[PDB]
Design a binder for these strands. Structure first.
Lengths: 120, 114, 56, 122, 209
RNA sequence: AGGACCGAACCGACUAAUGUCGAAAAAUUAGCGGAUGACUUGUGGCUGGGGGUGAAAGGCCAAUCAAACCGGGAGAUAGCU
RNA sequence: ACACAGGUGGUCAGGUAGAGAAUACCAAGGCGCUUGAGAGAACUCGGGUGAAGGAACUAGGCAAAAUGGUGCCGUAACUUC
RNA sequence: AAUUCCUUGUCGGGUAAGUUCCGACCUGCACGAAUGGCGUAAUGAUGGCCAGGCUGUCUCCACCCGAGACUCAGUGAAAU
RNA sequence: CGAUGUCGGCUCAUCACAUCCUGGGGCUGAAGUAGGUCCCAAGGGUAUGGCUGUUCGCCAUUUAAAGUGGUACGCGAGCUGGGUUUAGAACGUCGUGAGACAGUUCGGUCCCUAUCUGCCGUGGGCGCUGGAGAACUGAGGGGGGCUGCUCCUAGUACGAGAGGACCGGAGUGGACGCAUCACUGGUGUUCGGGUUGUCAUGCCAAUGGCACUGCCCGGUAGCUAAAUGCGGAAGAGAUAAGUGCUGAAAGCAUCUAAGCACGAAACUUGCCCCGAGAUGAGUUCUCCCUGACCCUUUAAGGGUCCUGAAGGAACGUUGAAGACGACGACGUUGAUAGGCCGGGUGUGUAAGCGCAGCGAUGCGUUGAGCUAACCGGUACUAAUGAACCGUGAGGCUUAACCU
């Protein structure tokens, strides 16, 4: 009955569920905007937001924990140097969810989950 | 809750001597025997400690005559008179439930003495 | 788990009553574009609540 | 928590060493025994010189459980290994003069005054 | 006598001086202002209508906003009703507080129970689960036989089956009171009351006096 | 040395569960048995309907067997529906 | 009968661990099984853990659990030795 | 007794309790000597029974991870 | 006989009264305790195991008791397939033989996605007549109803003694049911840690993937029981069997004929729950709307222009609410969800560097670091301004009232 439980199952096993966000967060960190399923977007906030707040204060310990997650060097390089110190003033809620029609193949709600930035 | 937390802290006893799980602890507990409020003792090894503020509890395992006794205690209770640590035991694991099956010299642990 | 007698147009008709589709007719008008978009969804041009967010 | 077919450790030196509860007394359609309830048991193994031998069917009363009795505040005095004190059929009065291991305060009901007054602890 | 509307706020425990612990439930009972006094001229029956809490003056509706203005009291959340015993009469504007429960000993806490969801017949009516082996195919937790045969030819009305378990409105009775705080607006009762943490609780003295 | 021992490939098919308008006109999954032998298998032959073959169950002989299949006697006959 | 969880003979057959062509993770190399998106009820299927008890279940310990390796010490009744 | 109807024969064992199991008594309804009799180490996916181990088989279930069930979108059966 | 699956077990029951227990009585070869039997009574209750395929039954131990029966000897589109009642096989037996034997023994695939009725839940439509938002009343319907023991009375009555009550009151248990996680706990594949093999991150180190969560040790929030509370009622009305009072018919007598009185867990209320679709559609309170036009088959009429209020819905954030609808919260005049901050809890002394040691490793920094769903806060992100549906004061007759 899942009273007060949290964490969408997303029709996948424990491994795949964890593994897809690791790959999905990488896409969000690298391109600053993606287009995914609406429920998948809402769950991505629970994973990215920590990884950004984790990247506030650059250190030796943090660059390993941000590597323990996301398992990549370009993500840790983009963070802590460009993305990380950029959110100095803002406290939480770095991302933004915006609904966009439906997927034209299975009728699934789409969403552009982007960061409050992109002023290049 | 501002209410629930308030109702707890007003009933919590102020002086509870802190102790990590694994210490040799002696506990004096008030015992009621018909018409006498005697103070019988109980000394043993802590194998678990539950921190829940007012609802906090701890367990003490004593290897009595013959077979062992596992007695838990309500921390903030009027039944628990005093709590005294004898041997500060050194273990690197939260709950010593691996000790329920150990006996003799196998059950003994290290003194902290840092 | 098999029918005894076949139902009719009366019976088959009643069952399809509640399965009729919905009509929204609540198309929003954009703040900047002034186009028709769904509630809370972005427009066909990426504009939303006035601000061009997709930059496309 | 002692239902039927439960093996126990004999607390008194009456002669038994391992007994089994055949039926929980004290009510109808009862689930399990407990604190200091009376149970009808059978002896699965006795010592060669005891007062009782294997095959007898007599009463007993539990003194130590692994389920543990609960104090009036939320304290449990769980033990290791279930125990019991043998008793005669018609007369409560136990058979073992010595009791090995502790008993609990809840057992005090005047008919077990003989038992608690033969306890090495508690 | 009358009852007062409250809200369940978790559960805690009290330690008596001798050390005996008692499970208590914190029930907040704030100012129970009385909106409508029911008269036997208009209704035929004798009762009062109270309210508690406080809503937002943009969420409250015009039909009900006028109802509070008819009384004069503040727009509290919800509206309930309590029966009178002819030996009492209340006034509109009177704020009935938790101090009325000072003399009482046993009350009947009433509240909407937790929603267990569409539960099975085992979890709902306490059925016994059938054998989970020895050849049993596709049937371990079903209801089993639900009738006789040709003679009755139907399922008797009232048969215990799978339905909406929970989220009903139950009444737990004879709960002994422990402490009545007027300052913090509290009410400590021994035992567990219905509902989840943060739901309503109509609290009235025991009918089984 | 072994119709020897434990155990994959391989061959077999004892239990259990799923399956039963199945993924499948006897399979899947988890465990089983034999596994240098009376073993197993590829390839090509040979035995044929009251006949063959059969470590023998009345089994098997192209999903059909206490007498296969196709065609012809034949529109058999049917005190029965 | 199908773009069918089935059947189809032989050959080559890397690395670490390992007795091993077992098994686990990888290479070379080839794939994600041709419906998807949510929700996270009963119930069913395949699994994981489990207080106290330990066959009381049942036609029956069927099923699950448990045992499991190498070296060493040690090993009864009976026996065709 | 894979044989015994009468029968759950009777006695002893095992269990607190044993229409099955083990050892006997023979009163063999209606065993019996190559349609073999009686033994028999070893072996058995064999038949019946007992005990230790071991456990959700059960007492009485509880929770959890997955695949369907349920909603939406496409395609789209059947027995009757 | 162009099919009605057969015994037993599991599950789930509902009903009868010819009552096993509890409740109320009469008689007794009823002193007491405890019984026998008859009558009234169907509210609730009404074993666990050994052997057996067994229903049955014998046995062991309990219990207040372990009722007899109907319901296709209830129940296979719910389960089991142990028995009977297929093909294999063998034993005794019968027959020359193929084979046969409610004689025996070993083995032997148990199909179905529910249209309809029924039933458990749960919505949509419309009606209730001006529309809407609420709060109820309550016809009627459902649930619940069991009981042991201990002690007081009193070791009095009774009785040679032994033994040993009635009525009434209190205490505390078992079974059952409802509710709830504060404690005891289980779970917790979203949290921390350890560790084998192995591959990758260039490598040391440190991390990550996979191996049933790899294997295990813990463990938050929920869920939940074995955990903790609570309950059955008292009383009242009307009675059953029974006991009566007065009292004729029938000078007496008689509970009955008039009349009056006590009398059971049964019946009706009392306790909770559903409930005005109770079309008999009820009641109360508040809120909103009082613009003009032509036609006319001048009808409770049609159509247009000007206005669309209360409110509902819809969309979104969603929820201790939930299959989907529905239900509750909130929508910036914001604390609804996420994030952030702090705290709590869990876990256990991170990493790095420094230090000792030949080295694994230990030591200090450090009970740090990391901490899911929880508590209290903070608008950083997302809940957009709006549009949509719903109208313009509410029929006829009569009565009584204000003019």
């Amino acid at each position: 009955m899942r009273h007060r439980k949290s964490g969408r199952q997303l029709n996948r096993n424990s491994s795949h569920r964890q593994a897809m966000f690791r790959n999905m967060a990488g896409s969000l960190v690298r391109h600053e905007i993606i287009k995914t399923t609406l429920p998948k977007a809402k769950e991505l906030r629970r994973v990215v937001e920590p990884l950004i707040t984790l990247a506030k204060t650059d250190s030796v310990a943090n660059r390993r924990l941000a590597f323990a997650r996301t398992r990549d060097n370009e993500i840790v390089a983009k963070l802590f140097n460009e993305l990380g110190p950029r959110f100095a003033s803002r406290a939480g809620g770095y991302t933004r969810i915006l609904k966009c029609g439906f997927r034209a193949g299975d009728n699934a709600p789409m969403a552009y989950i982007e960061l409050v930035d992109r002023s290049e | 809750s501002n209410i629930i937390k308030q109702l707890e802290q007003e009933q919590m006893k102020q002086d509870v001597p802190s102790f990590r799980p694994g210490d040799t602890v002696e506990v004096k507990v008030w015992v009621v025997e018909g018409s006498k409020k005697r103070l019988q003792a109980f000394e043993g090894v802590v194998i678990a400690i539950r921190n829940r503020g007012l609802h906090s509890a701890f367990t003490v395992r004593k290897i009595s005559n013959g077979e062992g006794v596992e007695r838990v205690f309500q921390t903030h209770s009027p039944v628990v008179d005093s709590i005294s640590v004898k041997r500060r035991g050194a273990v690197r694991k939260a709950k010593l439930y691996y000790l329920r099956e150990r006996t003799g010299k196998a059950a003994r642990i290290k003194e902290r003495l840092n | 788990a098999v029918q005894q007698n076949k139902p009719t147009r009366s019976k088959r008709g009643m069952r399809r009553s509640h399965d009729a589709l919905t009509a929204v007719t609540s198309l929003s008008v954009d703040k900047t574009s002034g186009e028709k978009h769904l509630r809370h969804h972005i427009t066909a041009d990426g504009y939303y609540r006035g601000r061009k967010v997709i930059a496309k | 928590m002692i239902q039927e077919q439960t093996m126990l450790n004999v607390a008194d030196n009456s002669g038994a060493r391992r007994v089994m509860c055949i039926k929980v007394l004290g009510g109808s359609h009862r689930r399990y025994a407990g604190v200091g309830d009376i149970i009808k048991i059978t002896i699965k193994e006795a010592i060669p010189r005891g007062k009782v031998k294997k095959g007898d069917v007599l009463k007993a009363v539990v003194v130590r459980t692994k389920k543990g009795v609960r104090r009036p505040d939320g304290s449990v005095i769980r033990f290791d290994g279930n125990a019991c004190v043998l008793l005669n059929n018609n007369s409560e009065q136990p058979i073992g003069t010595r009791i090995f291991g502790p008993v609990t305060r809840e057992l005090r009901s005047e008919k077990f005054m003989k038992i608690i007054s033969l306890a090495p602890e508690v | 006598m009358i009852g007062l509307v409250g809200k369940k706020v978790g559960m805690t425990r009290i330690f008596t001086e001798d050390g005996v612990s008692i499970p208590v439930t914190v029930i907040e009972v704030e100012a129970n202002r009385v909106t409508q006094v029911k008269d036997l001229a208009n209704d035929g029956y004798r009762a009062i209508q109270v309210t508690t809490g406080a809503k937002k003056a943009n969420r409250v509706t015009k039909p009900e906003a006028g109802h509070f203005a008819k009384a004069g009291v503040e727009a509290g959340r919800g509206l309930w009703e309590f029966r009178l015993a002819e030996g009492e009469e209340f006034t509109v504007g009177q704020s009935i507080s938790v101090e009325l429960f000072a003399d009482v000993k046993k009350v009947d806490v009433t509240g909407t129970s937790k929603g267990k969801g569409f539960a099975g017949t085992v979890k709902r009516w306490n059925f016994r689960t059938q054998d989970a082996t020895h050849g049993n195919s596709l049937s371990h937790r079903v209801p089993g036989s639900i009738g006789q045969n040709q003679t009755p030819g139907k399922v008797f009305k009232g048969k215990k089956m799978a339905g909406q378990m929970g989220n009903e409105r139950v009444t737990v009775q004879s709960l002994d009171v422990v402490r009545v705080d007027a300052e913090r607006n509290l009410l400590l009762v021994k035992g567990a009351v219905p509902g989840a943490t943060g739901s309503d609780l109509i609290v009235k003295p025991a009918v089984k006096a």
